[PDB]
Amino acid sequence: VDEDRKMYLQAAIVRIMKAKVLRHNALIQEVISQSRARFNPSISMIKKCIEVLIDKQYIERSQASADEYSYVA
Amino acid sequence: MLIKVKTLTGKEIEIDIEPTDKVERIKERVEEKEGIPPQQQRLIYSGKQMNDEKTAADYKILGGSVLHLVLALRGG
Amino acid sequence: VLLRAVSTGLPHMIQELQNHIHDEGLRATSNLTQENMPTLFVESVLEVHGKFVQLINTVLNGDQHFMSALDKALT
């Protein structure tokens, strides 16, 4: 299940980021908002997923912005 | 003061408040009564979304006042 | 009864009664160790429920607002 949550969390991030740019805090809260029905994700987990997503290059950070991410296709 | 708050079950709940209290606390009172995590809650006072770290006296909320609760809002 | 007579007397009492059962309940489970066996856990929670539910019935005369308080606190 633990691994599974990561994937779902990731799916949530991509899904949310698709629907363009969001601040880190906002993104996290939404992930919780979406995931609430299934389970409450640990904050630490989310952050890890976000980075994974960036490596995957699903989403990127804004060049000059405090904690902001853009959805990059 | 005791403020009334309209929930998403279609009812209205009165809760204990001090004007000096930060508004994020009211979210927790609403969790306690309605079982909705303060993480996902947004308080709207008369048309506008209430802040978090800002206090209730900053919004001039009185004991007759009424709050509306809605889930998170994002533009896109 | 004293508080009922005066206008808006009960709401403090509602929170107080809610804050209190919650502490006792939260404390009660802590007693039951890292075993996390369910039969003890269901039973401790029920012990507390039974004490207060009866208490709200007899003593407060079964007023709904306090009952809502209890439900939210037990959840």
From Swiss-Prot, chain A:
Effect of K18R: Loss of conjugation with NEDD8
Post-translational modification (record): Neddylated; which enhances the ubiquitination activity of ECS (Elongin BC-CUL2/5-SOCS-box protein) E3 ubiquitin-protein ligase complexes. Neddylation leads to structural rearrangment in the complex that allows interaction between the E2 ubiquitin-conjugating enzyme and the acceptor ubiquitin. CBC(VHL) complex formation seems to promote neddylation. Deneddylated via its interaction with the COP9 signalosome (CSN) complex.
Cellular compartments annotated: Nucleus
Stretch forming the signal peptide: none
Record cross-link Glycyl lysine isopeptide (Lys-Gly) (interchain with G-Cter in NEDD8), residues: K18
Residues covered by the Cullin neddylation domain: 4-63
Family of this protein: Belongs to the cullin family.
Subunit relationships: Component of multiple Cul2-RING (CRL2) E3 ubiquitin-protein ligase complexes consisting of CUL2, Elongin BC (ELOB and ELOC), RBX1 and a variable substrate-specific adapter; this complex is also known as ECS (Elongin BC-CUL2/5-SOCS-box protein) complex and may consist of CUL2 or CUL5. Component of a ECS(VHL) or CBC(VHL) complex containing CUL2, RBX1, ELOB, ELOC and VHL. Component of the ECS(MED8) complex with the probable substrate recognition component MED8.
Described purpose of this protein according to its UniProt entry: Core component of multiple cullin-RING-based ECS (ElonginB/C-CUL2/5-SOCS-box protein) E3 ubiquitin-protein ligase complexes, which mediate the ubiquitination of target proteins. CUL2 serves as a rigid scaffold in the complex and may contribute to catalysis through positioning of the substrate and the E2 ubiquitin-conjugating enzyme. The E3 ubiquitin-protein ligase activity of the complex is dependent on the neddylation of the cullin subunit and is inhibited by the association of the deneddylated cullin subunit with TIP120A/CAND1.
Domain comment as written in the entry: The Cullin neddylation domain restrains the RING domain of RBX1 in the E3 ubiquitin-protein ligase complex; this restraint is removed upon neddylation of the cullin.
UniProtKB/Swiss-Prot annotation, chain B:
Protein family membership: Belongs to the ubiquitin family.
Site label Interaction with UBE1C, positions: L8, I44
Annotated localization: Nucleus
Keyword Ribosomal protein: no
Molecular function terms from GO: protein tag activity; ubiquitin protein ligase binding
Gene Ontology CC annotations of this record: cytoplasm; cytosol; extracellular exosome; glutamatergic synapse; nucleoplasm; nucleus; postsynapse
Keyword terms, alphabetized: Acetylation, Isopeptide bond, Nucleus, Ubl conjugation pathway
Modified residues (N6-acetyllysine): K48
Record-listed cross-link Glycyl lysine isopeptide (Gly-Lys) (interchain with K-? in acceptor proteins), residues: G76
Tissue spec. comment: Highly expressed in heart, skeletal muscle, spleen, thymus, prostate, testis, ovary, colon and leukocytes.
UniProt xrefs under PANTHER family: UBIQUITIN (PTHR10666)
Protein modification: Cleavage of precursor form by UCHL3 or SENP8 is necessary for function. (Microbial infection) Deamidated at Gln-40 by bacterial cyclomodulin Cif produced by enteropathogenic E.coli, Y.pseudotuberculosis or B.pseudomallei, leading to impair NEDD8 ability to activate cullin-RING-based E3 ubiquitin-protein ligase complexes (CRL complexes). Deamidation occurs on NEDD8-modified cullins. NEDD8 deamidation prevents switching from the inactive to active state by maintaining the 'closed' structure of the CRL complexes. Deamidation may also impair its deconjugation by the COP9 signalosome; However this result needs additional evidences.
Bilayer-crossing regions: none
GO biological process terms held by the UniProt record: anatomical structure morphogenesis; modification-dependent protein catabolic process; protein localization; protein modification process; protein neddylation; proteolysis; regulation of postsynapse assembly; regulation of proteolysis
Modified residues ((Microbial infection) Deamidated glutamine): Q40
Subunit structure: Interacts with AHR; interaction is direct. Interacts with NUB1; interaction is direct. Interacts with ESR1.
Region (Interaction with UBE1C): 70-72
Keyword Repeat belongs to the record: no
Gene behind this protein: NEDD8
Alphabetical list of InterPro entries matching this protein: Nedd8-like, Ubiquitin-like_dom, Ubiquitin-like_domsf, Ubiquitin_CS, Ubiquitin_dom, Ubiquitin_ubiquitin-like
Pfam families, sorted: ubiquitin (PF00240)
Record protein name field: Ubiquitin-like protein NEDD8
Record annotation: effect of changing A72R: Prevents adenylation by UBE1C
Swiss-Prot record, chain C:
Compartments (UniProt record): Nucleus
PTM annotation: Neddylated; which enhances the ubiquitination activity of ECS (Elongin BC-CUL2/5-SOCS-box protein) E3 ubiquitin-protein ligase complexes. Neddylation leads to structural rearrangment in the complex that allows interaction between the E2 ubiquitin-conjugating enzyme and the acceptor ubiquitin. CBC(VHL) complex formation seems to promote neddylation. Deneddylated via its interaction with the COP9 signalosome (CSN) complex.
UniProt comment concerning the protein's domains: The Cullin neddylation domain restrains the RING domain of RBX1 in the E3 ubiquitin-protein ligase complex; this restraint is removed upon neddylation of the cullin.
Record note on quaternary structure: Component of multiple Cul2-RING (CRL2) E3 ubiquitin-protein ligase complexes consisting of CUL2, Elongin BC (ELOB and ELOC), RBX1 and a variable substrate-specific adapter; this complex is also known as ECS (Elongin BC-CUL2/5-SOCS-box protein) complex and may consist of CUL2 or CUL5. Component of a ECS(VHL) or CBC(VHL) complex containing CUL2, RBX1, ELOB, ELOC and VHL. Component of the ECS(MED8) complex with the probable substrate recognition component MED8. (Microbial infection) Interacts with human respiratory syncytial virus (HRSV) protein NS1.
Record-stated family: Belongs to the cullin family.
Name of the protein described by the UniProt record: Cullin-2
Taxonomic path: Eukaryota, Metazoa, Chordata, Craniata, Vertebrata
